């Protein structure tokens, strides 16, 4: 017998003690080795309720990633609360590694194995584990990168679809690669992302059809962000320590519903912190080819309000709350206390 409960989790990873890469360093001192032979118990015809939108596991992963960035990516100048903090800001080795989240004695993690599970409600196929799967703490907006894929159909996730103020997480069942490069050798900050147009438009059409099922077959329209900070209006992410801001206008235009899609990007030194603090400024980009090839595995969407009297629903890429990023991976888990 058990019950829903919150407790302090610990982490496990396969980090290398000899790596200077910041994630490896953090996990080496903050986590333990992973279990080579993990045990999993499938509960016989047990029904459990989940709520990915109210899961303390999310808050804890957030806290880990905040501390990791706080120790690994200190900017030259921090602007928060009115005070100005200056300090050294050397370039680092940066490449996210999988982090496992595990429960201590007296506790266990319940895992929903239901196909097409949306993250909330009852789960029929439930198993118990000590640790989650390996989750890379990838920080980004608009597009979710290097995450897990839905096993069956594309899944739409939201705490409340009817509430347009609540973020929508689209969980893809097929990866679309995004190839971002800052070429070696008139602007060290100019960059670009290449994406297979055929693959993207096909997936996006599948997402459209999926959104129809949730919005009474209303017409689904995609549009670029209306306004807001650059971190939100553009696809923001960190590649090799450098902050990339990419213009995704070409991705979200309800027209191509063929060739290569080249998104214009730029590396920014001055960033609005996702931690919520304030503003941070980093040193200029390192020289040479700066390249990151990522899997697009999900999308963060915000729905336009004031469309109730029309046959259209408008969706725009969003994000900014990194907790949603962790939710996209932790949705199927919950902690319970055993006796
Ligand atoms: C809640 C709300 C509206 C979200 C905002 N988000 C961000 O500034 C953000 O996500 N920035 C960011 C930075 C680097 C990378 Br790489 C990706 C994204 C920041 C705060 C202060 C928390 N307000
Ligand atoms: C329940 O989930 C487990 C783990 O994914 C899977 O092996 C099993 O086939 C599922 N059971 C059914 C009947 O769907
Ligand atoms: C998830 O599935 C449950 C099944 O009862 C349902 O109540 C809930 O509305 C679903 N959530 C979404 C966003 O589809
Ligand atoms: C992805 O999900 C959609 C439904 O959302 C489905 O039609 C399609 O077959 C899936 N693709 C793959 C490769 O499973
Ligand atoms: C979902 O959002 C709608 C629109 O804001 C609201 O009227 C409704 O109460 C919400 N549903 C729940 C279960 O809170
Ligand atoms: C990229 O996506 C493919 C599946 O489309 C997967 O096999 C591979 O592991 C992914 N790479 C990651 C997760 O970094
Ligand atoms: C990514 O794009 C760059 C520049 O076009 C290219 O050199 C590289 O081969 C690409 N990588 C992959 C895996 O497609
Ligand atoms: C969408 O249209 C199809 C085809 O007529 C219908 O079967 C289905 O019930 C509709 N779905 C919604 C959510 O309105
Ligand atoms: C993206 O590029 C388009 C032109 O292709 C431009 O109109 C738009 O302002 C850009 N978006 C942002 C957020 O800068
Ligand atoms: C969508 O693409 C078409 C291409 O002809 C363009 O004219 C239109 O302005 C685009 N809408 C946007 C970028 O919102
Ligand atoms: C995208 O993939 C398809 C095969 O799925 C291929 O035919 C097409 O050439 C690719 N497009 C690009 C831009 O490479
Ligand atoms: C995604 O994973 C690939 C393979 O490990 C990596 O090269 C790339 O830098 C990752 N993308 C991001 C945004 O971290």
Residue numbers in the entry: 44 to 124, 198 to 301, 324 to 355, 357 to 396, 411 to 492
Question: What does the article say, verbatim?
Answer:
The HIV-1 viral spike is composed of three copies of the gp120 envelope glycoprotein attached non-covalently to three copies of the gp41 transmembrane molecule. Binding of the primary cell surface receptor, CD4, to the gp120 component of the viral spike exposes and/or induces the formation of a site for co-receptor binding (either CCR5 or CXCR4). The NBD chemotype consists of three essential regions: Region I, a para-substituted aromatic ring; Region II, an oxalamide linker; and Region III, a tetramethylpiperidine heterocyclic ring system. Herein, we present the high-resolution structures of NBD-557 in complex with clades BYU2 and in complex with clade A/E93TH057 gp120 core, as well the structures of four Region III NBD-congeners, AS-II-37, AS-I-261, MAE-II-167, and MAE-II-188, in complex with the clade A/E93TH057 gp120 coree.
Concurrent with this study, our endeavor to crystallize unliganded HIV-1 gp120 core led us to identify clade A/E93TH057 extended core (coree), which produced well diffracting crystals in the absence of sCD4 or CD4i antibodies. The clade A/E93TH057 gp120 coree, however, required mutation of His 375 to Ser (H375S) to co-crystalize with small molecules. In both the NBD-557:clade BYU2 gp120 coreV3s:48d and the NBD-557: A/E93TH057 gp120 coree complexes, the Region I para-bromo substituted aromatic ring was inserted most deeply within the Phe 43 cavity. Comparison of the NBD-557:clade BYU2 gp120 core V3s:48d complex with the NBD-557:clade A/E93TH057 gp120 coree complex demonstrated that the conformation of NBD-557 was nearly identical, with only a slight deviation of the tetramethylpiperidine gem-dimethyl groups. In the NBD-557:A/E93TH057 gp120 coree complex, residues Thr 257, Glu 370, Ser 375, and Ile 424 made contacts with the Region I para-brominated aromatic ring of NBD-557, while Trp 427 made an aromatic-aromatic π-stacking interaction with Region I. Along the neck of the Phe 43 cavity, the nitrogen atoms of the Region II oxalamide linker formed hydrogen bonds with backbone carbonyls of Asn 425 and Gly 473. In Region III, the gem-dimethyl group at position 6 of the tetramethylpiperidine ring formed hydrophobic contacts with the Gly 429 backbone Cα atom on gp120. The tetramethylpiperidine ring made additional hydrophobic contacts with the gp120 surface in the cavity vestibule. Overall, the structures indicate that only the oxalamide linker of NBD-557 makes direct hydrogen bonds with gp120. Regarding Region III, which binds to the surface exposed vestibule of the Phe 43 cavity, the NBD-557:gp120 structures indicated that the amine of tetramethylpiperidine ring does not bind Asp 368 and that the contacts with gp120 were not optimal.
